[PDB]
């Protein structure tokens, strides 16, 4: 078994040469951002959401 497989049929493991390490494929992903602001007639201050 050189590489594993997940439900979504994507690569999640690999057999690196000379080390035989696990080396899971793509653990890290993106992150979401949202903006909270009041009406333009009051002010223009904003807040950042995750």
């Amino acid at each position: 078994q050189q590489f594993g497989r997940d439900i979504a049929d994507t690569t999640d493991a690999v057999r690196d040469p000379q080390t035989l390490e696990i080396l899971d494929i793509t653990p890290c992903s993106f992150g979401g951002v949202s903006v909270i602001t009041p009406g333009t007639n009051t002010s223009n201050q904003v807040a950042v959401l995750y």
């Binding site: 997940d6 979504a8 994507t10 992903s29 979401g32």
Partner: peptide, 22 residues
Amino acid sequence: RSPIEDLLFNKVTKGLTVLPPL
């Protein structure tokens, strides 16, 4: 939570995000 509420809670059991309820 109520004991009935607790029983009901116990009975109920990659590019995707789930919005938490408000």
